[PDB]
Design a protein around this ligand. Structure first.
Ligand SMILES: Nc1ncnc2c1ncn2[C@@H]1O[C@H](COP(=O)(O)OP(=O)(O)NP(=O)(O)O)[C@@H](O)[C@H]1O
Ligand SMILES: Nc1ncnc2c1ncn2[C@@H]1O[C@H](COP(=O)(O)OP(=O)(O)NP(=O)(O)O)[C@@H](O)[C@H]1O
Ligand SMILES: [Cl-]
Ligand SMILES: [Cl-]
Ligand SMILES: [Mg+2]
Ligand SMILES: [Mg+2]
Ligand code: NA
Ligand code: NA
Lengths: 384, 384
């Protein structure tokens, strides 16, 4: 019998536990498990983007929990009048709740859905929250998303910051249930490059391993790092950072003598594994600008794929209200970012090629060689 | 100042309008716009999967609205006691609400989040709902997700079904704002193949164009259709349908003399553009089973990619509670589906090759030729 009693409304965090895939991704291969950490880290990075956090400490504990401490402003603790509990508890227990729906608290933030840490909470057997704010230490414990007691003051402090420690629920996560140091370290190293001036520490209490990431030089240095064990073919890394029409665009790139393409795209410091409009704009400007240069200098018919071979690039955009296809933010679907990146790249890459004739000549050589190899592969295929 | 008044909770459907990308996808290139239709169509298909709907009519109206009529059971109309309004209104105005959180109303369904038609409503300037149920016609109008009046009886009927007509909000959708016949027709043709016995009609009132899709022969015929304007190299399409361990697995495939691979994956009739665990299991069993056959018959070192060239396949699984990474359901992230597909394929594909020696020999020839062409391309590349 199909009638009004067949219709169910899921309340609070029940939807997250019921359908974890739409909130955290794959709960079996480890990627969802580590995403729990990255949600908490993204909130600390957002305090760093806002200018308030200079140190982040990520700890893998020996009982398979993870903690993240930041020295930012602290999650607000005052009573939220509408809901009648502390703003921190609203944040931990209510979907689509937070301080990133306008630009008053965070001008630019990776966060935008009001869901992230509420997901972490919902999918954790236990979560510990410690907040340092307004001279006071506040603490609260959750079990499966349920607060055990109201947020309470436990003492005094000169400091500000937020600490979240969580133990993931094995009723949700299967197969890969332990944290992998190198997965966390990769992401934290990249965040250090993206956030100059912010100390990021990683500690593993299982084995005593630790890292301290504090690179200077930003994404230009990130490109150097990524070519470290490769062989760059030209010495001058192309780089710019601009802020035009409400949108920050920062690009670095360099070709090496290998045959792979590795472009890393980020929006408000969140990676897009599956690319998006920023990558589409980057590719479009590279193809245009190189073809124009080869035409003006008399070297020209290669395509956009021949520009790929040997490329390492980082594209990092800063956007007031970006649009992603999912909570995991694997893909950027904001059309005006395609145009901002394309426009800035066309102008600054053309200047780069004019100002660095030796590099330009080497890169043209590489593109031509890629095209020559592509055409020979094709003829060889046809002939078998 | 960052404090508890900085924390905002979005209510009702406000979150959908605020962050449409996580609910509908890209609101500028047309893909989100057409997804609005497919959400409504998916709900009618779910009535068809359940055995209650034999006809679906999709109409593109001349004012740029779309309607979908089905002859299923009808959206329940009785008052939902907890919320105090009709179950239909709860469905249209509340996220994570519906009848697909257990298997009592729909054994198997594409739907699972309780979000789809509430998203359509939230992002529509206007929505018209007409429900035929229990001898009565019920009607309600929404504007920007807001009901204008409570659901009302308007007359009598011998029929059952649901009709939804919506006008998409241009405050949300940009650039591609008109419906494209061929986008809808492609999806509806594929749903006809996936749902034998269900009449699917498409009508465009802008120009009088119409289609009636009612293919028989199912996914085996779908593979024939997809090779129609190509040249299959062997006459016998591989096909099976089984239901083992709670999971339905149905596969059809055939090689052609071209060089592209086109695998179409579906879970409860919803396509996965970005693949997933069903595709991973399909690839794994193909590689294993073909290598075993080539080893036993003495033809063997090709890889999994050489099995790709010329392949057309459809993989359709039926799963009680699948896991997707997003509301748009582009990717299946359920580990036990990888194993069900892999296991069923290994057993039935090996039988197929034994029972059809002429086809097996042709397919082995094709795999070998693909490998030969791959190796020649590689040597040619190296030498430039
Ligand atoms: N470490 C932190 N320091 C200060 N405020 C924080 C911190 N973590 C969370 N918050 C606050 O809690 C809110 C909710 O966080 P969260 O549930 O992650 O959603 P969000 O960051 O706003 N968006 P999203 O992560 O994309 O879902 C944030 O918007 C902040 O207002
Ligand atoms: N055409 C229909 N006929 C009968 N019942 C329907 C129909 N459309 C919607 N419903 C009911 O309305 C509920 C909510 O639909 P919807 O908001 O699309 O979510 P869902 O189909 O359950 N899941 P999802 O589409 O994955 O978000 C369904 O679960 C059904 O109970
Ligand atoms: Cl009812
Ligand atoms: Cl406060
Ligand atoms: Mg967040
Ligand atoms: Mg639905
Ligand atoms: Na914001
Ligand atoms: Na169900």
């Amino acid at each position: 019998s199909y009638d009004s009693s067949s219709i169910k409304v899921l309340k609070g965090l029940d939807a997250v536990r019921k359908r974890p895939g739409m909130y955290i991704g794959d709960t079996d291969d480890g990627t969802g498990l580590h995403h729990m950490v990255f949600e908490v880290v993204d909130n600390a990075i957002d305090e760093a983007l806002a200018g308030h956090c200079k140190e982040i400490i990520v700890t893998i504990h020996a009982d398979n929990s993870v903690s993240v401490q930041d020295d930012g402003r602290g999650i607000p603790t005052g009573i939220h009048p509408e809901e009648g509990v502390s703003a921190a508890e609203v944040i931990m227990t209510v979907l689509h709740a937070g301080g990133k729906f306008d630009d008053n608290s965070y001008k630019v933030s990776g966060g935008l859905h009001g869901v992230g840490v509420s997901v972490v909470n919902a999918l954790s057997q236990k979560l510990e929250l410690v907040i340092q704010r307004e001279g006071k230490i506040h603490r609260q414990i959750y079990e499966h998303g349920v607060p055990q007691a109201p947020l309470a003051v436990t003492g005094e402090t000169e400091k500000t910051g937020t600490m979240v420690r969580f133990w993931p629920s094995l009723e949700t996560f299967t197969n890969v249930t332990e944290f992998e140091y190198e997965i966390l370290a990769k992401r934290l190293r990249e965040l250090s490059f993206l956030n100059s001036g912010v100390s990021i520490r990683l500690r593993d209490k299982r084995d005593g391993k630790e890292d301290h990431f504090h690179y200077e030089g930003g994404i230009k240095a990130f490109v150097e790092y990524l070519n470290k064990n490769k062989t760059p073919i030209h010495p001058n890394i192309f780089y710019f950072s601009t802020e035009k029409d409400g949108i920050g665009v920062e690009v670095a790139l360099q070709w090496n003598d290998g045959f792979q393409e590795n472009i890393y795209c980020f929006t408000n410091n969140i990676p897009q594994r599956d690319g998006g409009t920023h990558l589409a704009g980057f590719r479009a400007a590279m193809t245009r600008t190189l073809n124009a240069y080869m035409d003006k200098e008399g070297y020209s018919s290669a395509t956009g794929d021949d520009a790929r071979e040997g490329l390492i690039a980082v594209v990092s955009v800063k956007v007031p209200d970006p649009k992603f296809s999912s909570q995991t933010k694997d893909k950027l679907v904001s059309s005006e970012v395609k145009s901002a990146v394309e426009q800035q790249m066309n102008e600054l890459l053309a200047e780069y090629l004019l100002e660095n004739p030796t590099d330009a000549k080497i890169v043209v050589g590489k593109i031509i060689d890629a095209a020559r190899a592509r055409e020979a592969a094709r003829r060889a295929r046809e002939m078998t």
